């Protein structure tokens, strides 16, 4: 679920407030269309796409599904007790968190005008 995703972010990127990733580029946060503005936005595009794919699983709701995961000593793990939906969503989130940690953050791309620049 989003609360868990937020925690994954806090875990792999402890140097930025999680909010910094909540409204960035065309894909990070609410937005979900257009051309990704940079490598960080591409992380979010793939993440959004990953959620769309999981929604195909009957009864699978990525924003709300609680999965089983651990973040200890610099390592994020999705656990084995996850059903297909939970496993898929956990991996979507895990891969995005890792992606965020390796991507450059451009303050200029935070809170951009989605209606004008992302369609
Ligand atoms: C806005 C939202 O509900 O989810 C997110 C939180 C942090 C980063 C990205 C997103 C997203 O939906 O793309
Ligand atoms: Ca999005």
JSON list of C-alpha atoms and ligand atoms in Angstrom, two decimals:
[
{"chain": "A", "resi": 1, "resn": "UNK", "atom": "CA", "xyz": [0.00, 0.00, 0.00]},
{"chain": "A", "resi": 2, "resn": "UNK", "atom": "CA", "xyz": [1.03, 3.65, -0.37]},
{"chain": "A", "resi": 3, "resn": "UNK", "atom": "CA", "xyz": [1.99, 3.86, 3.32]},
{"chain": "A", "resi": 4, "resn": "UNK", "atom": "CA", "xyz": [4.43, 0.99, 2.72]},
{"chain": "A", "resi": 5, "resn": "UNK", "atom": "CA", "xyz": [5.77, 2.50, -0.49]},
{"chain": "A", "resi": 6, "resn": "UNK", "atom": "CA", "xyz": [6.41, 5.73, 1.47]},
{"chain": "A", "resi": 7, "resn": "UNK", "atom": "CA", "xyz": [8.38, 3.69, 4.01]},
{"chain": "A", "resi": 8, "resn": "UNK", "atom": "CA", "xyz": [10.44, 2.00, 1.29]},
{"chain": "A", "resi": 9, "resn": "UNK", "atom": "CA", "xyz": [11.37, 5.45, 0.01]},
{"chain": "A", "resi": 10, "resn": "UNK", "atom": "CA", "xyz": [12.35, 6.62, 3.51]},
{"chain": "A", "resi": 11, "resn": "UNK", "atom": "CA", "xyz": [14.46, 3.52, 3.69]},
{"chain": "A", "resi": 12, "resn": "UNK", "atom": "CA", "xyz": [16.41, 3.75, 0.44]},
{"chain": "A", "resi": 13, "resn": "UNK", "atom": "CA", "xyz": [16.57, 7.54, 0.30]},
{"chain": "A", "resi": 14, "resn": "UNK", "atom": "CA", "xyz": [16.84, 8.76, 3.91]},
{"chain": "A", "resi": 15, "resn": "UNK", "atom": "CA", "xyz": [18.47, 12.04, 2.75]},
{"chain": "A", "resi": 16, "resn": "UNK", "atom": "CA", "xyz": [15.15, 13.41, 1.14]},
{"chain": "A", "resi": 17, "resn": "UNK", "atom": "CA", "xyz": [11.68, 13.91, 2.49]},
{"chain": "A", "resi": 18, "resn": "UNK", "atom": "CA", "xyz": [9.37, 11.36, 0.91]},
{"chain": "A", "resi": 19, "resn": "UNK", "atom": "CA", "xyz": [7.17, 14.33, -0.26]},
{"chain": "A", "resi": 20, "resn": "UNK", "atom": "CA", "xyz": [9.93, 15.30, -2.72]},
{"chain": "A", "resi": 21, "resn": "UNK", "atom": "CA", "xyz": [8.88, 12.33, -4.81]},
{"chain": "A", "resi": 22, "resn": "UNK", "atom": "CA", "xyz": [5.14, 12.87, -4.44]},
{"chain": "A", "resi": 23, "resn": "UNK", "atom": "CA", "xyz": [4.82, 15.56, -7.16]},
{"chain": "A", "resi": 24, "resn": "UNK", "atom": "CA", "xyz": [7.70, 15.34, -9.61]},
{"chain": "A", "resi": 25, "resn": "UNK", "atom": "CA", "xyz": [7.75, 15.28, -13.40]},
{"chain": "A", "resi": 26, "resn": "UNK", "atom": "CA", "xyz": [4.83, 13.89, -15.37]},
{"chain": "A", "resi": 27, "resn": "UNK", "atom": "CA", "xyz": [4.64, 10.50, -13.59]},
{"chain": "A", "resi": 28, "resn": "UNK", "atom": "CA", "xyz": [5.70, 10.85, -9.94]},
{"chain": "A", "resi": 29, "resn": "UNK", "atom": "CA", "xyz": [2.54, 11.28, -7.94]},
{"chain": "A", "resi": 30, "resn": "UNK", "atom": "CA", "xyz": [-0.88, 12.05, -9.40]},
{"chain": "A", "resi": 31, "resn": "UNK", "atom": "CA", "xyz": [0.21, 12.51, -13.03]},
{"chain": "A", "resi": 32, "resn": "UNK", "atom": "CA", "xyz": [0.34, 9.50, -15.36]},
{"chain": "A", "resi": 33, "resn": "UNK", "atom": "CA", "xyz": [0.87, 10.59, -18.99]},
{"chain": "A", "resi": 34, "resn": "UNK", "atom": "CA", "xyz": [3.16, 12.30, -21.53]},
{"chain": "A", "resi": 35, "resn": "UNK", "atom": "CA", "xyz": [6.91, 12.15, -22.01]},
{"chain": "A", "resi": 36, "resn": "UNK", "atom": "CA", "xyz": [9.01, 11.48, -18.88]},
{"chain": "A", "resi": 37, "resn": "UNK", "atom": "CA", "xyz": [11.03, 14.64, -18.21]},
{"chain": "A", "resi": 38, "resn": "UNK", "atom": "CA", "xyz": [14.11, 12.87, -16.86]},
{"chain": "A", "resi": 39, "resn": "UNK", "atom": "CA", "xyz": [15.53, 9.59, -15.48]},
{"chain": "A", "resi": 40, "resn": "UNK", "atom": "CA", "xyz": [13.72, 9.99, -12.11]},
{"chain": "A", "resi": 41, "resn": "UNK", "atom": "CA", "xyz": [10.41, 10.53, -13.91]},
{"chain": "A", "resi": 42, "resn": "UNK", "atom": "CA", "xyz": [11.15, 7.38, -15.93]},
{"chain": "A", "resi": 43, "resn": "UNK", "atom": "CA", "xyz": [11.33, 5.48, -12.62]},
{"chain": "A", "resi": 44, "resn": "UNK", "atom": "CA", "xyz": [7.84, 6.68, -11.90]},
{"chain": "A", "resi": 45, "resn": "UNK", "atom": "CA", "xyz": [6.56, 5.87, -15.40]},
{"chain": "A", "resi": 46, "resn": "UNK", "atom": "CA", "xyz": [7.66, 2.23, -15.03]},
{"chain": "A", "resi": 47, "resn": "UNK", "atom": "CA", "xyz": [6.15, 2.20, -11.52]},
{"chain": "A", "resi": 48, "resn": "UNK", "atom": "CA", "xyz": [2.82, 3.48, -12.82]},
{"chain": "A", "resi": 49, "resn": "UNK", "atom": "CA", "xyz": [2.92, 0.91, -15.65]},
{"chain": "A", "resi": 50, "resn": "UNK", "atom": "CA", "xyz": [3.70, -1.78, -13.05]},
{"chain": "A", "resi": 51, "resn": "UNK", "atom": "CA", "xyz": [0.61, -0.83, -11.06]},
{"chain": "A", "resi": 52, "resn": "UNK", "atom": "CA", "xyz": [-1.53, -0.92, -14.19]},
{"chain": "A", "resi": 53, "resn": "UNK", "atom": "CA", "xyz": [-0.36, -4.43, -14.86]},
{"chain": "A", "resi": 54, "resn": "UNK", "atom": "CA", "xyz": [-1.10, -5.54, -11.26]},
{"chain": "A", "resi": 55, "resn": "UNK", "atom": "CA", "xyz": [-4.63, -4.14, -11.50]},
{"chain": "A", "resi": 56, "resn": "UNK", "atom": "CA", "xyz": [-5.26, -6.92, -14.03]},
{"chain": "A", "resi": 57, "resn": "UNK", "atom": "CA", "xyz": [-5.14, -9.44, -11.18]},
{"chain": "A", "resi": 58, "resn": "UNK", "atom": "CA", "xyz": [-8.63, -10.07, -9.86]},
{"chain": "A", "resi": 59, "resn": "UNK", "atom": "CA", "xyz": [-9.20, -8.11, -6.66]},
{"chain": "A", "resi": 60, "resn": "UNK", "atom": "CA", "xyz": [-5.72, -6.56, -6.79]},
{"chain": "A", "resi": 61, "resn": "UNK", "atom": "CA", "xyz": [-5.61, -2.88, -5.78]},
{"chain": "A", "resi": 62, "resn": "UNK", "atom": "CA", "xyz": [-2.02, -1.59, -5.65]},
{"chain": "A", "resi": 63, "resn": "UNK", "atom": "CA", "xyz": [-2.64, 1.62, -3.72]},
{"chain": "A", "resi": 64, "resn": "UNK", "atom": "CA", "xyz": [-4.39, -0.34, -0.95]},
{"chain": "A", "resi": 65, "resn": "UNK", "atom": "CA", "xyz": [-2.95, -3.89, -0.92]},
{"chain": "A", "resi": 66, "resn": "UNK", "atom": "CA", "xyz": [-0.89, -4.58, 2.20]},
{"chain": "A", "resi": 67, "resn": "UNK", "atom": "CA", "xyz": [2.08, -6.76, 1.39]},
{"chain": "A", "resi": 68, "resn": "UNK", "atom": "CA", "xyz": [4.82, -8.27, 3.52]},
{"chain": "A", "resi": 69, "resn": "UNK", "atom": "CA", "xyz": [8.29, -6.67, 3.23]},
{"chain": "A", "resi": 70, "resn": "UNK", "atom": "CA", "xyz": [11.39, -5.76, 5.28]},
{"chain": "A", "resi": 71, "resn": "UNK", "atom": "CA", "xyz": [13.90, -2.92, 5.12]},
{"chain": "A", "resi": 72, "resn": "UNK", "atom": "CA", "xyz": [16.93, -3.63, 7.34]},
{"chain": "A", "resi": 73, "resn": "UNK", "atom": "CA", "xyz": [20.57, -2.67, 7.02]},
{"chain": "A", "resi": 74, "resn": "UNK", "atom": "CA", "xyz": [20.27, -1.03, 3.63]},
{"chain": "A", "resi": 75, "resn": "UNK", "atom": "CA", "xyz": [18.35, -3.92, 2.07]},
{"chain": "A", "resi": 76, "resn": "UNK", "atom": "CA", "xyz": [14.71, -4.03, 0.85]},
{"chain": "A", "resi": 77, "resn": "UNK", "atom": "CA", "xyz": [13.15, -7.48, 0.63]},
{"chain": "A", "resi": 78, "resn": "UNK", "atom": "CA", "xyz": [9.69, -8.62, -0.43]},
{"chain": "A", "resi": 79, "resn": "UNK", "atom": "CA", "xyz": [8.83, -11.70, 1.66]},
{"chain": "A", "resi": 80, "resn": "UNK", "atom": "CA", "xyz": [7.60, -15.14, 0.66]},
{"chain": "A", "resi": 81, "resn": "UNK", "atom": "CA", "xyz": [4.20, -15.00, 2.40]},
{"chain": "A", "resi": 82, "resn": "UNK", "atom": "CA", "xyz": [2.87, -12.71, -0.35]},
{"chain": "A", "resi": 83, "resn": "UNK", "atom": "CA", "xyz": [0.10, -13.91, -2.70]},
{"chain": "A", "resi": 84, "resn": "UNK", "atom": "CA", "xyz": [0.34, -13.10, -6.41]},
{"chain": "A", "resi": 85, "resn": "UNK", "atom": "CA", "xyz": [-1.16, -9.63, -5.97]},
{"chain": "A", "resi": 86, "resn": "UNK", "atom": "CA", "xyz": [0.95, -8.76, -2.91]},
{"chain": "A", "resi": 87, "resn": "UNK", "atom": "CA", "xyz": [4.14, -10.12, -4.51]},
{"chain": "A", "resi": 88, "resn": "UNK", "atom": "CA", "xyz": [3.58, -8.14, -7.71]},
{"chain": "A", "resi": 89, "resn": "UNK", "atom": "CA", "xyz": [2.79, -4.85, -5.96]},
{"chain": "A", "resi": 90, "resn": "UNK", "atom": "CA", "xyz": [5.67, -5.27, -3.49]},
{"chain": "A", "resi": 91, "resn": "UNK", "atom": "CA", "xyz": [8.10, -5.73, -6.37]},
{"chain": "A", "resi": 92, "resn": "UNK", "atom": "CA", "xyz": [6.67, -2.74, -8.25]},
{"chain": "A", "resi": 93, "resn": "UNK", "atom": "CA", "xyz": [7.36, -0.61, -5.16]},
{"chain": "A", "resi": 94, "resn": "UNK", "atom": "CA", "xyz": [10.76, -2.16, -4.34]},
{"chain": "A", "resi": 95, "resn": "UNK", "atom": "CA", "xyz": [12.12, -1.63, -7.84]},
{"chain": "A", "resi": 96, "resn": "UNK", "atom": "CA", "xyz": [10.88, 1.96, -7.90]},
{"chain": "A", "resi": 97, "resn": "UNK", "atom": "CA", "xyz": [12.50, 2.72, -4.49]},
{"chain": "A", "resi": 98, "resn": "UNK", "atom": "CA", "xyz": [15.79, 1.35, -5.75]},
{"chain": "A", "resi": 99, "resn": "UNK", "atom": "CA", "xyz": [15.35, 3.32, -8.98]},
{"chain": "A", "resi": 100, "resn": "UNK", "atom": "CA", "xyz": [14.76, 6.56, -7.01]},
{"chain": "A", "resi": 101, "resn": "UNK", "atom": "CA", "xyz": [17.98, 6.03, -5.03]},
{"chain": "A", "resi": 102, "resn": "UNK", "atom": "CA", "xyz": [20.06, 5.94, -8.21]},
{"chain": "A", "resi": 103, "resn": "UNK", "atom": "CA", "xyz": [18.39, 8.81, -10.06]},
{"chain": "A", "resi": 104, "resn": "UNK", "atom": "CA", "xyz": [19.42, 12.49, -10.04]},
{"chain": "A", "resi": 105, "resn": "UNK", "atom": "CA", "xyz": [16.93, 14.88, -8.44]},
{"chain": "A", "resi": 106, "resn": "UNK", "atom": "CA", "xyz": [16.29, 18.12, -10.38]},
{"chain": "A", "resi": 107, "resn": "UNK", "atom": "CA", "xyz": [14.50, 20.71, -8.23]},
{"chain": "A", "resi": 108, "resn": "UNK", "atom": "CA", "xyz": [13.30, 22.32, -11.51]},
{"chain": "A", "resi": 109, "resn": "UNK", "atom": "CA", "xyz": [11.13, 19.30, -12.29]},
{"chain": "A", "resi": 110, "resn": "UNK", "atom": "CA", "xyz": [9.24, 19.32, -8.97]},
{"chain": "A", "resi": 111, "resn": "UNK", "atom": "CA", "xyz": [5.56, 20.42, -9.18]},
{"chain": "A", "resi": 112, "resn": "UNK", "atom": "CA", "xyz": [5.53, 21.08, -12.94]},
{"chain": "A", "resi": 113, "resn": "UNK", "atom": "CA", "xyz": [2.39, 22.08, -14.83]},
{"chain": "A", "resi": 114, "resn": "UNK", "atom": "CA", "xyz": [0.93, 18.69, -15.85]},
{"chain": "A", "resi": 115, "resn": "UNK", "atom": "CA", "xyz": [-1.82, 20.12, -18.09]},
{"chain": "A", "resi": 116, "resn": "UNK", "atom": "CA", "xyz": [0.67, 22.08, -20.19]},
{"chain": "A", "resi": 117, "resn": "UNK", "atom": "CA", "xyz": [3.76, 19.87, -20.20]},
{"chain": "A", "resi": 118, "resn": "UNK", "atom": "CA", "xyz": [2.53, 16.27, -19.92]},
{"chain": "A", "resi": 119, "resn": "UNK", "atom": "CA", "xyz": [0.08, 15.60, -22.73]},
{"chain": "B", "resi": 1, "resn": "LIG", "atom": "C1", "xyz": [0.33, 10.16, -5.58]},
{"chain": "B", "resi": 1, "resn": "LIG", "atom": "C2", "xyz": [0.27, 8.74, -5.09]},
{"chain": "B", "resi": 1, "resn": "LIG", "atom": "O1", "xyz": [-0.78, 8.31, -4.61]},
{"chain": "B", "resi": 1, "resn": "LIG", "atom": "O2", "xyz": [1.42, 7.81, -5.15]},
{"chain": "B", "resi": 1, "resn": "LIG", "atom": "C3", "xyz": [2.77, 8.10, -5.20]},
{"chain": "B", "resi": 1, "resn": "LIG", "atom": "C4", "xyz": [3.57, 8.42, -4.11]},
{"chain": "B", "resi": 1, "resn": "LIG", "atom": "C5", "xyz": [4.90, 8.71, -4.28]},
{"chain": "B", "resi": 1, "resn": "LIG", "atom": "C6", "xyz": [5.51, 8.67, -5.52]},
{"chain": "B", "resi": 1, "resn": "LIG", "atom": "C7", "xyz": [4.79, 8.34, -6.67]},
{"chain": "B", "resi": 1, "resn": "LIG", "atom": "C8", "xyz": [3.41, 8.09, -6.57]},
{"chain": "B", "resi": 1, "resn": "LIG", "atom": "C9", "xyz": [2.62, 7.69, -7.78]},
{"chain": "B", "resi": 1, "resn": "LIG", "atom": "O3", "xyz": [1.43, 7.44, -7.75]},
{"chain": "B", "resi": 1, "resn": "LIG", "atom": "O4", "xyz": [3.18, 7.68, -8.99]},
{"chain": "B", "resi": 2, "resn": "LIG", "atom": "CA1", "xyz": [1.72, 8.50, -11.26]}
]
